[PDB]
Structure 1
Amino acid sequence: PQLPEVETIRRTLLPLIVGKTIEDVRIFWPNIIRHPRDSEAFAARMIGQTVRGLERRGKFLKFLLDRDALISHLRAEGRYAVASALEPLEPHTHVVFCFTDGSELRYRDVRKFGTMHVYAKEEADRRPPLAELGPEPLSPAFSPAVLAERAVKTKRSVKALLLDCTVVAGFGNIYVDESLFRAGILPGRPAASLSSKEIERLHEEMVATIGEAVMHLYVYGRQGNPCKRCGTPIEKTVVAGRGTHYCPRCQR
């Protein structure tokens, strides 16, 4: 799920679990559990707690319980569902939170790639994986000035900068390529080479790109196809270790 999808998950899941009390936690793939390191401690501590809220930070879900917060990252294919304990589990179900009402919050992930961390609520923000997370891209805390400051200080490409979770929260590969296209900026450009004008324009398109989604791609995955603005074939290379898509005419 992308940031906008996580926000949608956050919004839709909350009513389905709020006020429910955990009676058991069943773990079928312990490696998903990152903190406490022992999956048996993770399960034990959550038993008896009631779900009070669900927040989002970047692509992280933060389940707020009585004492603890469960911080959950789904990566690409992780999915939550609420369903009856009487019915068979779906394939690739790795963790199940059983509620006293006979319902379950189930975490599936064919890729077994997601993570869960549990800490006392008051500690979650200063521990992994939330520690160091940059500002929400739709927040005033993410400004052209902030972006400019990170850009000047680094030798990395502008794409590498935008992919940095400490720079801005949860801006994935797709939105990075799309935003840079809309801003007219090549992804391989050194971040420090961007003019003030370019920094402003980039900030503006990041917000619009991700803002529009929280309510049709120009370049991502469209390599070999015509640019939608100028008809030039979209190209794909590797930048910052990622598949990178761009129009060599629109972007400079």
Structure 2
Amino acid sequence: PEIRRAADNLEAAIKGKPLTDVWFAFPQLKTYQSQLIGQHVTHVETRGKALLTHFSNDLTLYSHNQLYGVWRVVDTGEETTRVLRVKLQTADKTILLYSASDIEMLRPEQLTTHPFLQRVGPDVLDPNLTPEVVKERLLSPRFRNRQFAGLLLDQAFLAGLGNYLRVEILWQVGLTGNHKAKDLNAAQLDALAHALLEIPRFSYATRGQVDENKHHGALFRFKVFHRDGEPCERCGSIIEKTTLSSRPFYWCPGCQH
């Protein structure tokens, strides 16, 4: 929805600024404190209800607030009943993590193997998530060999993808749901990599209030979702749709193959 706001608060506070002080409550983590001084937060990726705070040295602080965790932005100096776990501090700002337990420092190699992380992929409406990153994911050994039909329906791959976006996405790059990221030339792979973000962001950026369609058509129009029996704006073929089915698939047997 828009729960991806806590991450913006942290980025908006310490992103890019060199860390002047880093402190961790967990002893296992104390070893990363001095290593970060001088470094900065490149960005904060969201993953389900977790936060991945990336640093300029390739390290990544994983943290799941669960039931009580709560970040707080203060001023370098401003110092309450809750127990502090993490303290990242810049010249002007300092963000603080209180009450959390699910806290880990991960190396790039440990990202794809982390239990929770391999259950929820980046969110398509996440500004920091770039096409170049989606392509990598598409080509990783974990997905490169999956049919898009289900892959685009699997939240472990990418968060924010519903069946109504799956069909539209596939129709824009002319593909049927039986393709794999491994049966695609460089261009085809990149076309879809941009599709997965553009139509989802396009769809949302322009959503209109309810019942508004009664007097005004949205700027974003579906091309195959709920358009079975109508012609395809592209080639004119009658758009079909599967039954037999998880989520009703939609496509143009004419220009999708």
TM-score by length of 2: 0.47
- The structure having more radius of gyration, on CA atoms, is 2
| Structure number with higher strand proportion | 1
TM-score by length of 1: 0.48
